[PDB]
Design an enzyme around this catalytic site. Structure first.
Site, PDB file in Angstrom:
ATOM      1  N   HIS B 128      15.491   3.487 133.273  1.00 44.24           N
ATOM      2  CA  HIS B 128      16.024   2.366 134.042  1.00 44.24           C
ATOM      3  C   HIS B 128      15.352   1.032 133.671  1.00 44.24           C
ATOM      4  O   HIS B 128      16.028   0.006 133.454  1.00 44.24           O
ATOM      5  CB  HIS B 128      15.815   2.686 135.523  1.00 44.24           C
ATOM      6  N   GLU B 129      14.021   1.042 133.594  1.00 45.73           N
ATOM      7  CA  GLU B 129      13.266  -0.165 133.256  1.00 45.73           C
ATOM      8  C   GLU B 129      13.604  -0.649 131.846  1.00 45.73           C
ATOM      9  O   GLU B 129      13.803  -1.839 131.612  1.00 45.73           O
ATOM     10  CB  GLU B 129      11.770   0.084 133.386  1.00 45.73           C
ATOM     11  N   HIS B 132      16.846  -2.590 131.735  1.00 48.21           N
ATOM     12  CA  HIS B 132      16.663  -4.006 132.073  1.00 48.21           C
ATOM     13  C   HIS B 132      16.021  -4.790 130.937  1.00 48.21           C
ATOM     14  O   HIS B 132      16.434  -5.912 130.650  1.00 48.21           O
ATOM     15  CB  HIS B 132      15.843  -4.151 133.347  1.00 48.21           C
ATOM     16  N   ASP B 198      29.153  11.306 122.746  1.00 48.34           N
ATOM     17  CA  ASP B 198      29.355  12.170 121.591  1.00 48.34           C
ATOM     18  C   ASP B 198      30.348  11.484 120.674  1.00 48.34           C
ATOM     19  O   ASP B 198      31.424  11.095 121.124  1.00 48.34           O
ATOM     20  CB  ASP B 198      29.906  13.521 122.049  1.00 48.34           C
ATOM     21  N   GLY B 264      36.982  30.850 131.643  1.00 46.45           N
ATOM     22  CA  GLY B 264      36.596  30.833 133.039  1.00 46.45           C
ATOM     23  C   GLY B 264      35.324  31.616 133.332  1.00 46.45           C
ATOM     24  O   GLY B 264      34.608  31.284 134.274  1.00 46.45           O
ATOM     25  N   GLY B 267      34.429  35.786 138.072  1.00 44.95           N
ATOM     26  CA  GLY B 267      34.912  35.015 139.205  1.00 44.95           C
ATOM     27  C   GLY B 267      36.380  34.657 139.067  1.00 44.95           C
ATOM     28  O   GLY B 267      36.959  34.847 138.011  1.00 44.95           O
ATOM     29  N   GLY B 273      45.225  23.690 131.067  1.00 41.12           N
ATOM     30  CA  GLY B 273      45.009  23.175 129.727  1.00 41.12           C
ATOM     31  C   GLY B 273      45.479  21.742 129.571  1.00 41.12           C
ATOM     32  O   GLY B 273      44.923  20.993 128.778  1.00 41.12           O
ATOM     33  N   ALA B 284      36.762  37.988 133.333  1.00 40.45           N
ATOM     34  CA  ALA B 284      36.867  38.935 134.442  1.00 40.45           C
ATOM     35  C   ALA B 284      37.354  38.173 135.670  1.00 40.45           C
ATOM     36  O   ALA B 284      37.141  36.972 135.774  1.00 40.45           O
ATOM     37  CB  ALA B 284      35.513  39.579 134.715  1.00 40.45           C
ATOM     38  N   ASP B 303      50.431  26.710 124.118  1.00 39.08           N
ATOM     39  CA  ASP B 303      49.222  27.376 124.599  1.00 39.08           C
ATOM     40  C   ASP B 303      49.216  28.839 124.178  1.00 39.08           C
ATOM     41  O   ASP B 303      50.273  29.467 124.069  1.00 39.08           O
ATOM     42  CB  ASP B 303      49.197  27.399 126.129  1.00 39.08           C
TER      43      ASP B 303
HETATM   44 CA   LIG Z   1      37.506  34.584 135.638  1.00 35.15          CA
HETATM   45 CA   LIG Z   2      29.957  16.269 118.682  1.00 35.10          CA
HETATM   46 CA   LIG Z   3      44.619  20.304 126.514  1.00 39.29          CA
HETATM   47 CA   LIG Z   4      48.457  22.801 126.938  1.00 40.24          CA
HETATM   48 CA   LIG Z   5      34.064  31.547 136.618  1.00 40.67          CA
HETATM   49 CA   LIG Z   6      41.068  37.516 134.609  1.00 39.42          CA
HETATM   50 CA   LIG Z   7      34.848  15.917 120.314  1.00 39.25          CA
HETATM   51 CL   LIG Z   8      34.874  38.705 138.458  1.00 37.22          CL
HETATM   52 CL   LIG Z   9      38.869  41.746 136.264  1.00 39.98          CL
HETATM   53 ZN   LIG Z  10      18.738  -1.685 137.598  1.00 39.54          ZN
END
Ligand SMILES: [Ca+2]
Ligand SMILES: [Ca+2]
Ligand SMILES: [Ca+2]
Ligand SMILES: [Ca+2]
Ligand SMILES: [Ca+2]
Ligand SMILES: [Ca+2]
Ligand SMILES: [Ca+2]
Ligand SMILES: [Cl-]
Ligand SMILES: [Cl-]
Ligand SMILES: [Zn+2]
Ligand SMILES: [Cl-]
Ligand SMILES: [Cl-]
Ligand SMILES: [Zn+2]
Lengths: 7, 380
Positions: B128-129, B132, B198, B264, B267, B273, B284, B303
């Site tokens: 931060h400093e 400035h 990036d 994913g 969970g 997308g 899973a 896709d």
């Molecule tokens: Ca999943």
């Molecule tokens: Ca890159």
């Molecule tokens: Ca996309």
């Molecule tokens: Ca797509």
């Molecule tokens: Ca997940």
């Molecule tokens: Ca799945």
């Molecule tokens: Ca990229």
């Molecule tokens: Cl799961």
């Molecule tokens: Cl599953």
């Molecule tokens: Zn500041």
């Protein structure tokens, strides 16, 4: 011109 | 808009010097009790400098001895009256030709200042400093150590963006190849707080090590909720991140207009997308692959859903209701439009999901699925 950072 | 190049001078690089003061005749603020930087402060200050030179066209070169420097570092411990100051934190002076311009000063009586490598507020204060001293004007107990989204934009406005940074395939989060502490999580107890800069290549947000429900957004300028925190991760303006990996939590992964690979993990995840030809792995769990318009998966850039689980995963086409709820057809389109069909390619074990939108003379939406799918997996 001085800027202070919060503590 | 002051920079080291003058006033209202934009997009111009700078080569700057910095110095860890070993003594002073006075501190420009009037504080007293000078103490020079210790070894840890020096290392952390250089890391902060690097986080600035990463995003903007700044080069920093250390000078020593009696050489003058653009940016200086030193600690204080007492006020102008000579009394101990254990309350203040730090301050810095803007670029200029005046005495003390670019100098930054930190209270050595603060443990976070003495120990910036183990007390995150100290590293943040350095960053931060320095901001400035370069001309910038302005999470559950953790503090981001590098420049955040607005400061990245502001510093690039002053000095130009650094287009040489991480131009390869870069991974942020777990399994990071960035060699930056603020982009790196070594285990699930580590909090990530960053805004990614990036400049090229195919890049990944790997947040696989967390069990929290996460929201990961790959859109330029957008914020993500990562590792149980909120809005702790963002993507700087001017940056395209391509891939994302969620953790064992029930996550939401939102792609951008680029071709994204979204995973994913365990969970029950929601994957979207967006535009472009995306490749989707629910992992899973009971996952949902969401389509918000016909432009999400055109035949010319379709896709893939590479791990679809019949009877378990879902494909959400409810968005198409806005022009009339889709009717599922067994093996032929009627020509009336607003119809969807699952076509099995027995030779390759691929299910082609074809969607014919009203007003289209040809069938223009396709999602290819590596595996079987059933009508009851499709939400209309
Ligand atoms: Ca999943
Ligand atoms: Ca890159
Ligand atoms: Ca996309
Ligand atoms: Ca797509
Ligand atoms: Ca997940
Ligand atoms: Ca799945
Ligand atoms: Ca990229
Ligand atoms: Cl799961
Ligand atoms: Cl599953
Ligand atoms: Zn500041
Ligand atoms: Cl007191
Ligand atoms: Cl999009
Ligand atoms: Zn932390």
């Amino acid at each position: 011109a001085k800027a202070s950072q919060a503590a | 808009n002051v920079s080291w190049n003058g006033t209202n001078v934009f997009g111009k690089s700078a080569n700057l010097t910095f110095k860890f003061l070993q003594s002073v005749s006075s501190i420009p603020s009037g504080d007293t009790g000078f103490v020079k930087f210790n070894a840890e402060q020096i290392e952390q200050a250089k890391l902060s400098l690097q986080s600035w030179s990463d995003v903007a066209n700044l080069t920093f070169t250390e000078v020593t001895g009696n050489k003058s420097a653009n940016i200086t570092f030193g600690n204080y411990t007492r006020d102008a009256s000579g009394n101990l100051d254990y309350g203040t934190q730090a301050y810095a002076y803007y670029p200029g030709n005046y005495q003390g311009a670019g100098s930054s000063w930190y209270n050595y009586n603060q443990s976070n200042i003495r120990n910036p490598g183990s007390e995150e507020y100290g590293r943040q204060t350095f960053t931060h400093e320095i901001g400035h001293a370069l001309g910038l004007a302005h999470y559950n107990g953790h503090y981001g150590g590098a420049p955040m989204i607005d400061d990245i934009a502001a510093i690039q406005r002053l000095y130009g963006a650094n287009m040489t940074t991480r131009t390869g395939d870069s991974v942020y989060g777990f399994n990071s190849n960035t060699d930056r502490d603020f982009y790196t999580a070594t285990d699930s107890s580590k909090a990530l707080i960053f805004s990614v800069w990036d400049a090229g290549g195919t890049d990944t947000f790997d947040f696989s090590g967390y069990s929290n429900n996460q929201r990961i957004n790959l859109n330029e300028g957008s914020f993500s909720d990562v590792g149980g925190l909120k809005g702790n991760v963002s993507i700087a303006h001017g940056v395209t991140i391509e891939n994302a990996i969620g953790g064992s939590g029930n996550d939401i992964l939102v792609g951008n207009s680029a071709d994204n690979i979204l995973q994913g993990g365990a969970g029950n995840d929601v994957l979207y997308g967006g535009a472009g030809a995306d490749t989707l792995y629910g992992g899973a769990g009971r996952d949902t692959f969401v389509y918000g318009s016909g432009q999400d998966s055109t035949v010319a850039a379709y896709d893939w859903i590479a791990d679809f689980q019949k009877g378990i995963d879902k494909i959400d086409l409810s968005a198409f209701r806005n022009e009339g709820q889709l009717s599922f057809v067994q093996d032929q389109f009627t020509g009336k439009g607003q119809e969807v069909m699952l076509q099995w390619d027995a030779a390759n074990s691929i299910t082609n999901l074809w969607l014919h939108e009203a007003g289209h003379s040809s069938v223009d939406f396709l999602v290819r699925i590596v595996g079987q799918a059933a009508q009851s997996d499709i939400i209309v």
